[model samples]
Target: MKVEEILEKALELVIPDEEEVRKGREAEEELRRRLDELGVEYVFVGSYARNTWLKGSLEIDVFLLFPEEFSKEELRERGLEIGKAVLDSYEIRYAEHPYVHGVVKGVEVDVVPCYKLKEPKNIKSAVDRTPFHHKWLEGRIKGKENEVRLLKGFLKANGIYGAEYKVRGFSGYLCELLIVFYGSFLETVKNARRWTRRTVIDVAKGEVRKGEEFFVVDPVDEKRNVAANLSLDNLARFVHLCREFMEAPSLGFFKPKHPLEIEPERLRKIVEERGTAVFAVKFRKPDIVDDNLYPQLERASRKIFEFLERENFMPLRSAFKASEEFCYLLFECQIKEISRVFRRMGPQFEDERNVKKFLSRNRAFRPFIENGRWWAFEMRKFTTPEEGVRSYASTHWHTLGKNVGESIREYFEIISGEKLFKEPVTAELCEMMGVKD
Candidate 1:
């Protein structure tokens, strides 16, 4: 299909129908009535208030704005209590701070507690700038709601929507700003093709220029980067996606890609064919919000990967996954088991004192001097990747991450070969190996 036809069909899928809009409005009104009864000062924000929400994923963001005189502790305490009173059922969630996430009239709602400051300058937390963002884009994004949805649909389909740590992609507000800056989804994509690492867009002022991977100046807070959380690789994916969509003009671009299903046997076959070793450090997942947990998981994975590299296990790639029970740090390496002895380079023979120390320190088969440098075939502590990692994680788990390391210290498993398939990390392993069913 042509670009026009593809976009037209996509709009039908994304835009909320009359019933959905009515249900959302009813939920909002009911929520407002409860807040009014409680005499709590609040305002609806985010895509719900801005009318840019997708069809099935409408979430109402109600900011519980407390007066400037109220301390943050007071805001948090009173805000949660009020949210509990308003919503039918709720669970506490976290961003910069804890907020109430629950349902009202079958629509999802978030009761965020924030300071009702007159200026964005006096904001205490990141979420405090949200109301100002709502105000700044109030009249500006009115007519481009559908365009925002289109941009969102495209990003979501391509697996890069949401500014959360998990996705590290576009936020709804950022999508709105892009539409507001470029006028339409088509224009945004067209211009995105030309976007480079130095791209800086100021929604409020075009004169501002700040070098970044991709910068969309927050219209409310100039210092804050709206797209700062967006990773460079995700940005490249978006840019490349735009280029691909413009050239092909396919409806498939708006459709989400399905996950690959690989049986254990098949995964083993693939691993054997590629002649790569796969290993996972499995442990109990720490009970924490995704925002905190994902970063920790990533940090721990990198630490383990680095450890493997230092041990002469040629680690090819690494990924992490968390289930309700366990968090798995998966790695692929070119060589899992190496020789028992490796040549350890020592100080030059000219340094007589250092040479003596090196020979005494290392248990070497033979100490030799070649080209003015001293070398020795020293015994490796753990020749196998599994053994080395188990020993390292047992001793140096603290260096991985705070929460994750604590979990590792309690109980962890070094999984490899066919044993990995028995665990629920085959999907992650498949992704790391780039093998799709």
Candidate 2:
């Protein structure tokens, strides 16, 4: 499907419901009434006023302005009292500080209390920085909304938009602005660092000069300069990943294929046959877990393997090993490992730590901290470090050729489930699994 068409459909799905809108307005009214009672002035910021992303998500952000005469403490106390009253009456969640957030009918309302300074722009300077960029980009990308929407849609459909820790869902405004400046999405990825580093200029100019000074023209940053946080290496890697996504839409940038869909039966079979080596396979030792707690780590290893299988995580291998003596468990799994596993098992398994905690609570298992690493044990005897090592060796030797063989079968299964593998699975599939490629 064309990216544009897909974006429009997704946007429709994202629009907020009428009931949600009504609730937002009601919350705003209630907040305004409370503010009046407190005699506090405020400014409305974020999605409600901007009407960007509001069609889908309802969030009302109000910045409370205290009178010049009120002391900081007085302003805080008054704000807190008013915030508490609103939350109590509406049964909405609220926080006190830079902002107070309340939820009414599933819509989020943020009430930010700010002491009015002599200069309003200075007040914004002190507020969290993202809103300023958000406002700036919103105006700049107004005309190019469709392009931005298309990029967002493409990322969303391919599951790369918010798949990485570095770049969450690329905002429509940011995507559109990048496209406008970079000319193509591919170029945007190549020059993400530059784009991120560049100041928000009022006019569109081509590549920025290295030494030329640029000032941000946004409301909050009246004269401040903006720089990029992403490094050049990071940008290059991101671009490479983007290229891969373009070539193969199914390979999630950070998420692997779903575990159950990838090789449910085979993964289970491996665990049954090879035991805990299923957890220890390709295990990078210290990189995976603490080295100090090498001893008494048997049950912990077994528990981790059982959890991975029970959850049915795609890319089930652990990055770290478990060490009871060290009191740490540093296993790493792909996003698909957690996501697909949870999809089948339910959201209850969304968090790995939560899973571990649940297991620790089991009557048959006992979790303890030794030498700073979390170790699990059976009642009578703890598995010694040497014993754990032996166990690992046994499992690894048994599972040596199993991962490659099983992964191939699993890849075909995933393609079949997606109805995308019409052709026979080949060596190329193994390469895609990072076996040879």
Candidate 3:
């Protein structure tokens, strides 16, 4: 579908109707009353205060500014306490860290407490900065509500309008406001000015620049290429598509350019031509003197398999198959060990229960059985050994998506130096399962 059509559909889904707005307003008023009772001053921010979008989708950003006499720690403690009280009284679900959120009058309200600093403007500088831009666009758009509506409709239809990832599209009103202020929204982009890269706190608690930062030309530089980054043609095309589709656009259409496909093919061809060659093979069993160890290894393998099955920890079909193969090889080694034991101690060393126990407790075997089961159900979602192994390797190891892959890579890197893995096999299998190198 065209971007505009998608944008319209998205906008409809997001914009709250009159009834929704009334409900939201009621919730905000109730929250305000509670804050008043607690003697805390607050100002609405985000979409709600900006009057850019309808109430339903607009989050009620209640800025709980603390008194000057209160210290930062004191304010934080009191704010949390008050936030908790409000949540408890209203029977609302709320989070304590970062910001507090709860249901008030059937509308979700986010309560953010801030310390009032000497230069109050700097205290909530980011929050204050947004309003300036909001007003600037509003003033620019003045009377062209329809154009703004069309712009928002395009963004919504295209799917680049929400806060799903990071980009947030202008609301219908905001779009109209922009058009009204700048005569033509297209013109505004063509004559757009550069802004400083002031440090701002992002949702992740990391400091980031407020606006787009280009490496070639320092975005903060006074005399920078303002037009180089700002493309009117692209913006117009996007807006045009928004109008055509009468909806928001999907973000999938826009993907980063890369040469990985070519590189992978080139690497694969090189590897195939070179072929595989045996590197080295070494075995040491200085203690094994007995020759009847094969039978003992078989018995141990059977017991381990039985134990895994009994505990419902058997690797599902695919994983089970791979594990079974691994188990069989392990059993072969176990038999060799048992044979050596028998040879060393003569005929008296016949019992193999200790050997079986040792194999069962072997760290390598533990993951193949234990973590294999976890990987099957939790990550792979496989029922059979075959499916489990395939899914585990593909989804958990190789990763199914970008976000999942990045997170998995980060987690492994962080714990790589830790003594979490007891054996090489376990570590190898885990990396294989998670698709990590």
Candidate 4:
């Protein structure tokens, strides 16, 4: 299909219908009525308020504006009380400050507290700038809501939509700004093809030359890059996706990738065919918000990967998954077990002092000279990957992170081979092997 036809069909899939809009309004109205009764001041923000929300993904962001003089404790105490009174059921979620999240009229709502500020400079928390964002986009993005939806659908389908730590992708505000800057979704994608590592889109003014690899300067604050959280790889992915879509526009571009269903037996067979040893370091997932948890998980996984490589495990690739019960750091290695003797390279022959010291220090074998460098054999500490990981995790757990390292220090198990044939572990292993089918 042509680009126009594909986008039109995609819009049909993304645009929220009259009923959904009405439901959103009803939820907002109910929340507003309760807030008003409690004498709380707020303004609706985010995608819902801007009318750019995708179908079935409506999240109402209501920012309760408190006077700058209000104490942090007062804001937290009163804000949570109003939120609880407004919603049928609620749970407290934390960012820079705690906020209430709940459902009203079957629509999700977030009651965030922020100090009302005249400018973005004296903002207390990150969310304080949200009202400024809403204000800036109100007039400019009035007619481009459908375009924003198209851009969001494209990014969401490609798994790079959220601005959270895990996804490190585009935020809703970023999508809105792109549509406003480029005039439409197609134009934005068209221009994205020309973007480089230093590409800068100064939406407020043409005034930024430095920041993240891909800089989308926040209109409210020129000092901050709106795309700071967007990883370089994800930026490249978006650029590549744009090029592909422009070349051959298809409905598939707006549809999410289908998940692969790999049973344990199939996973085991795939591992055997690849001839790589897979290991999973299993530990209890900490009870924390995903925004806080994912970074630590990535940190721990990277540390484990490095440790495996340094121990001569020849780690090929690594991935991590955090479920409700457990967090698994999975790794694939070229060699799971090595010989008891580890070869250590020593100082060059020209360094006569170190050469004599190298021979004297190692009683395991006779030191030999190869390519003018001295080499000696020493006994390996732990020959298998499992033993090595357990030893490292026990001793060097502090290198992981504060929470994750403490969790690892408490208890962790190294599972490999047949023991890894479980529901989510099998699925994660399949993903690590790049199994799409």
TM-score of each: 0.93, 0.46, 0.40, 0.90
Per candidate, the number of residue pairs that clash is 0, 21, 61, 0
Clashes of 4: 0
lDDT of 3 at 51: 51
lDDT tens digits, residue span 64-133, model 1: 9998888778989999999899998999987669999999999999999988988778876688998998
**How would you order the candidates by TM-score, starting with the best?**
1, 4, 2, 3
Candidate-wise lDDT, in order: 0.88, 0.43, 0.38, 0.87
Q: What ranking of all candidate models by lDDT puts the best one first?
A: 1, 4, 2, 3
Off by over 4 Å in 2: 17-26, 33-38, 54-56, 68-71, 88-98, 117-138, 141-264, 269-276, 280-437
lDDT of 2 by residue, 1-437 (tens): 44334334555444556776677778778667766786767666654654444344467776666676777778767765555555423323332244456664465666655566653454433454444444555565554544454455445544444312334334343444466666554455445434333334432444344433433233344444332222334434455656665455332332334423333444344334433322222222232222222322333344544544444432343322222211222222232212111111111444567657646455543554544454554341212222233343344433323332232223211111112222222222222333321
Question: Tens digit of lDDT per residue, candidate 3, span 344-375?
Answer: 11111233564344344323223222321211
Report the number of backbone clashes for model 1.
Answer: 0
Better of 2 and 4 by lDDT: 4
Model 3 residue 233 CA deviation (Å) reads 15
Q: What 10-residue stretch in candidate 3 is worst by lDDT?
A: 334-343
Which portions of model 3 miss their true places by more than 4 Å?
Answer: 1-16, 54-56, 87-97, 117-150, 166-437
Best TM-score among the predictions, by candidate number: 1
Model 1 pairs whose backbones collide: none
